[PDB]
């Protein structure tokens, strides 16, 4: 029930927090070193879903989650806008070439498309990523000034590899998106299995800040 009179510009700042200190298990040091893919996202309405927990990822997202290929996903978003007018604009931020680091982009939301979603692939990984699914920046007739979120690893459900550098192994039948925790999947061989922790620490963080580039 958003009633925001005018659109609003926001800066989205992604912070990678995948350090060896925070996540020592099987930490990728070379060929390739721990890093992140480009950040791809969009401002949209509830009629469009880039991804959702417990839902199958689109072929476009599968390609992005497994190889950082963003073209098919970009075409899907473009097609969604043409078919259901569910997308205001697509945005992206440069990839972070290391475990820790930052990257940013500017986006615009409007009452009709006040939701923001984005995905960033964990490199290297079978099909693991982080992101936000339909964060609503509108709160009635006003735009939220700021949104700070902790990000946790997700499994696309397309590749069954157990570790960051595991060779490709298609998941059949295909599974749905699942959140990866310190206890699930449960096995010493799994990259994020830390039985001594109550929960995994955030692997990344993101901040949406309403910009003041005009009155």
Contact indicator for 149, 206 with CB cutoff of 8 Å: yes
Q: Is 108 annotated as a binding residue?
A: yes
Contact indicator for 92, 41 with CB cutoff of 8 Å: yes
Q: How far is CA 118 from CA 130, 133, 140, in A?
A: 8, 7, 23
User: Which residues lie across from 151 on neighbouring strands?
Assistant: 204
- Relative orientation angle of helices 59-67 and 71-84, to the nearest 10 degrees: 150
Is residue 168 involved in binding Ni ion (CB under 5 A)? yes
Q: Vertex 53, ends 50 and 56: CA angle to 5°?
A: 65
Q: Single out the segment in contact with Ca ion by CB under 5 A; choices: 77-85, 123-131, 144-152, 200-208.
A: 123-131
Q: How far is CA 169 from the centre of its chain?
A: 22
Is residue 92 involved in binding a second copy (CB under 8 A)? yes
The item of Ni ion, Ca ion, a second copy, none sharing an interface with residue 38, based on CB under 5 to 8 Å by kind, is a second copy
Using the minimum distance from each CB to Ca ion, give the nearer residue, 13 or 166. Answer: 166
Using the minimum distance from each CB to a second copy, give the nearer residue, 7 or 101. Answer: 101
Minimum distance from residue 65 beta carbon to Ca ion (Å)? 9
Query: Starting from the edge strand earliest in sequence, which strands make up the sheet with 204-210, in order?
Result: 100-109, 8-17, 204-210, 146-151
Using the minimum distance from each CB to a second copy, give the nearer residue, 53 or 67. Answer: 67
The item of a second copy, Ni ion, Ca ion, none sharing an interface with residue 132, based on CB under 5 to 8 Å by kind, is none
Distance, in Å, from the CA atom of 116 to the CA atom of 136, rounded to the nearest integer, reads 7
Minimum distance from residue 180 beta carbon to Ca ion (Å)? 9
Q: Single out the segment in contact with a second copy by CB under 8 A; choices: 87-95, 133-141, 177-185, 202-210.
A: 87-95
Q: Is 141 annotated as a binding residue?
A: no
Q: Residue 168: count other Cβ atoms within 10 Å of its Cβ.
A: 12
Q: Is 159 annotated as a binding residue?
A: yes
- Under rule CB under 8 A, which residues in 17-76 are in contact with a second copy? 31-32, 37-38, 40, 67-71, 74
Q: Applying CB under 8 A, which residues contact a second copy?
A: 31-32, 37-38, 40, 67-71, 74, 89-90, 92-98, 101-106
């Amino acid at each position: 029930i958003c009633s925001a009179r005018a659109p609003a510009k926001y800066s989205i700042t992604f912070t990678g927090k995948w350090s060896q200190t925070a996540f020592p298990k099987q930490y990728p040091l070379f060929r390739p070193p721990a890093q992140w893919s480009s950040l791809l996202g969009a401002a949209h309405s509830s009629d469009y879903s880039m991804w959702r927990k417990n839902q199958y990822v689109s072929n476009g997202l599968r390609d992005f989650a497994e190889r950082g290929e963003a073209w098919a996903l970009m075409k899907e978003i473009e097609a969604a806008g043409e078919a259901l007018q569910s997308v205001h604009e697509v945005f992206s931020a440069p990839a972070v070439p290391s475990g820790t680091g930052q990257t940013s982009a500017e986006l615009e939301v409007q009452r009709r498309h006040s939701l923001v979603s984005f995905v960033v692939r964990i490199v290297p990984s079978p099909d693991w990523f982080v992101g936000v699914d339909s964060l609503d920046l509108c709160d009635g007739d006003r735009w939220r000034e700021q949104a700070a979120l902790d990000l946790y690893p997700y499994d696309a459900g397309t590749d069954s590899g157990f570790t960051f550098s595991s060779p490709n192994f298609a998941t059949i039948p295909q599974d749905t998106v699942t959140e990866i925790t310190s206890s699930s999947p449960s096995h010493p061989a799994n990259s994020f299995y830390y039985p001594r922790l109550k929960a995994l620490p955030p692997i990344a963080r993101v901040t949406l800040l309403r910009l003041r580039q005009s009155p």
